[PDB]
């Protein structure tokens, strides 16, 4: 047949071990580029001047890091939101000094990950499935956009993007608390409800279904062999589970409709994590957590401290110490 | 299709009100984030120069100029963290700018009282504040009732733009499924995967 | 999509029990250590290098500076029984802030 | 970097001992009559 037609058939084929698809055509090169650059940088990149003050921070293993302390360090504050590809540098040496790898990695990743979401829609369509798995994945994806793109945009610099490393993540979190009081922000609080609740409901669902598996095996064998891949019948007794959980709380707190149950399992952490992402994305424009500093005042006017004020003291310590050489003027305005 | 378009527009509007001070005049909406940061550098440049500081030759702790430095392409710009905001342009600042960036002669001789006033106003009305409208950084004590219209408009429209992207995906996925005839689930009698070769 | 998938429904649901239950148990263990101040506070190699080499900086050393800020600034009010009085001059602070 | 001199053997044995335990169990399962 036609060459283009045959290529299109291969790309969109439901028979490839890993689905390619049209989103995959962008996803594959961008994720490979992000991955390869990340690995090389994490191992071998020299120190990077993250805060634009000629104070280069070592991120790579060969330059004295371990797994926990290592990072791909964000691009220089001197660059800000400027696009800094390799060809904008006079040399690779300059590019490395200024945090070029970070921009390359995060842009390819965010593109690749957006296509990952689209690819998820795409295969669902090819297989005759319902389409919304990609909608659930939009919660972690949005969260990645929040910390790698949206927050830098709002703050005016990719140097304020989340670092690509374990201790760098903690740095980002602590500074974020100092500057936004994220803990006192209801979107982050909804985020915590999402992930605590998601983990809770994960353990709950797992324990309840596991609790009511139909006896199909002997004592000297795993219960997992009692289910066979693709069997028509259900492997557990949902009436039994419901009977248990309905008596644990009360009858009407327990789901007897599996479709309702599984929708709830999807929705709770997805919605919660959406709010988490929107927390970061709105604090990006400095609409910050609740501020109750000196809210409680006695008859004379003496400040009566609350736990909010104790948080404020910790926030202060973080604030005064962070990027100890970068501030010349009294207010940290971005 | 329309949800996808409105999402895109929402994200654009967010960036417009955050960065643009032409169709979103700072006189009405307040200074932008970049603007207020630049205004602080300007404020302390003025104060310290009035005290006798040679702001051009003042080396900061890092080695970079305390008040003035170069951008990565050489233009003279404000120092400190606001190095990131050197793309900022504003009517109160531009009289000080020449072909090479900020002009040291103009800085020494030509800064008017209205420029000092504006810089101080914008520095102290930076778009930072809490959800309960306490102005300033997160560690500020209660006193000033202020959140910028720029923050209100940026945050709201990011939220709306985001959920509209979710809406786009929801309805785009459903429209495809419904048109192909499987939005209600898989046909038990004709399950497509069952007719496909196994992957391995 | 992902390269791997569940094929056993029973394993799937057990794993869903296993993951968060095991996670919380692990965190409990770490808190037991913190009861005794038996922390993962430092990496000794990092500290030896940094002490000798004032140009060596990592995200680990950066975070310790933040911890030192937290301690000095929160302790007087957070631990009032200690009657801490930290004269302003002793408080750790970076430039300007 | 002046790392602990037992870190290498600690890590190597941490990896090898249980991995070997699993490898032993897997291979003897495969070799059983089907």
């Amino acid at each position: 047949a036609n060459l283009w037609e045959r290529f299109c058939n291969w790309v969109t084929s439901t028979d490839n071990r890993l689905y390619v698809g049209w989103f995959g055509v962008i996803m594959i090169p961008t994720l490979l580029a992000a991955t390869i650059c990340f690995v090389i940088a994490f191992i071998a990149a020299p120190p990077v001047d993250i805060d634009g003050i000629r104070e280069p921070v070592s991120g790579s293993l060969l330059y004295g890091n371990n797994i926990i302390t290592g990072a791909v360090v964000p691009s220089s504050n001197a660059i800000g939101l400027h696009f800094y590809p390799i060809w904008e540098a006079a040399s690779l040496d300059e590019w490395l000094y200024n945090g070029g790898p970070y921009q390359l990695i995060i842009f390819h990743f965010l593109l690749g990950a957006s296509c990952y979401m689209g690819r998820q829609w795409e295969l669902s369509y090819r297989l005759g499935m319902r389409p919304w798995i990609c909608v659930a994945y939009s919660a972690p994806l949005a969260s990645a956009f929040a910390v790698f793109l949206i927050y830098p945009i709002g703050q005016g610099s990719f140097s304020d993007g989340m670092p690509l490393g374990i201790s760098g993540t903690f740095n980002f979190m602590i500074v974020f608390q100092a500057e936004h009081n994220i803990l006192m922000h209801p979107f982050h609080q909804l985020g915590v409800a999402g992930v605590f609740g998601g983990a809770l409901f994960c353990a709950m669902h797992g324990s309840l279904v596991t609790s009511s598996l139909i006896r199909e095996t002997t004592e000297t064998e795993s219960a997992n062999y009692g289910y066979k891949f693709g069997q028509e019948e259900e492997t557990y007794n949902i009436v039994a589970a419901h009977g248990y959980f309905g008596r644990l709380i009360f009858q009407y707190a327990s789901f007897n409709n599996s479709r309702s149950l599984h929708f709830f399992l999807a929705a709770w952490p997805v919605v919660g994590v959406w709010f988490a992402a929107l927390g970061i994305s709105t604090m990006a424009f400095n609409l910050n957590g609740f501020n109750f500093n000196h809210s409680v005042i006695d008859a004379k006017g003496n400040v009566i401290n609350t736990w909010a004020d104790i948080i404020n003291r910790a926030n202060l310590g973080m604030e005064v110490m962070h990027e100890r050489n970068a501030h010349n003027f009294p207010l940290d305005l971005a | 299709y329309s949800l996808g378009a409105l999402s895109m527009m929402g994200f654009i509007a967010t960036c417009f009100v955050w960065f643009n001070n032409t169709v979103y005049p700072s006189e009405f909406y307040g200074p932008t984030g970049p603007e207020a940061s630049q205004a602080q550098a300007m404020t302390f440049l003025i104060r310290d120069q009035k005290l006798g500081a040679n702001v051009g030759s003042a080396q900061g702790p890092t080695g970079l100029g305390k008040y003035l430095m170069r951008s990565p392409t050489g233009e003279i710009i404000f120092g400190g963290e606001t190095m990131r905001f050197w793309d900022f342009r504003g009517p109160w600042l531009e009289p000080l700018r020449g072909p090479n960036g900020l002009d040291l002669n103009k800085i020494k001789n030509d800064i008017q009282p209205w420029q000092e006033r504006r810089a101080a106003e914008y520095m102290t009305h930076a778009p930072l504040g809490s959800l309960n409208s306490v102005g300033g950084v997160a560690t500020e004590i209660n006193s000033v009732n202020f959140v910028s219209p720029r923050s209100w408009l940026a945050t709201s429209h990011f939220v709306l733009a985001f959920f509209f992207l979710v809406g786009h995906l929801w309805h785009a996925g459903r429209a495809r499924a419904a048109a192909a005839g499987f939005e209600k689930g898989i046909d038990r009698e004709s399950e497509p995967v069952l007719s496909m070769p196994s992957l391995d | 999509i992902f390269g791997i998938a569940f094929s056993n429904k029973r394993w799937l649901h057990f794993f869903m029990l296993f993951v968060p239950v095991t996670g919380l148990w692990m965190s409990a263990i770490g808190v037991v250590g913190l009861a005794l101040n038996l922390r993962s506070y430092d990496f000794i190699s990092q500290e030896i290098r940094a002490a000798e080499d004032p140009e060596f900086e990592t995200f680990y050393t950066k975070n310790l500076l933040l911890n030192e800020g937290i301690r000095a600034w929160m302790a007087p009010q957070d631990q009032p029984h200690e009657n801490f009085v930290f004269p302003e001059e002793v408080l750790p602070r970076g430039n300007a802030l | 970097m002046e790392v602990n001199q037992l870190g290498l053997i600690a890590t190597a044995l941490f990896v090898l001992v249980p991995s070997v335990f699993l490898i032993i169990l897997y291979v003897q399962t495969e070799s059983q009559q089907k």
């Binding site: 191992i43 293993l61 891949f229 | 196994s198 | 390269g3 | 970097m1 790392v3 870190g7």
Partner: peptide, 30 residues
């Protein structure tokens, strides 16, 4: 030596991903 150790463990993991995907036990309908 540490760096070698970290890179080694990482490389073993990526190798494991490969075998776990391409040399998995094939799911079968009985």
């Amino acid at each position: 030596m540490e760096t070698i150790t970290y890179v080694f463990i990482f490389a073993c993991i990526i190798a494991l991903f490969f075998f776990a995907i391409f040399f998995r036990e094939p799911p079968r309908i009985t």
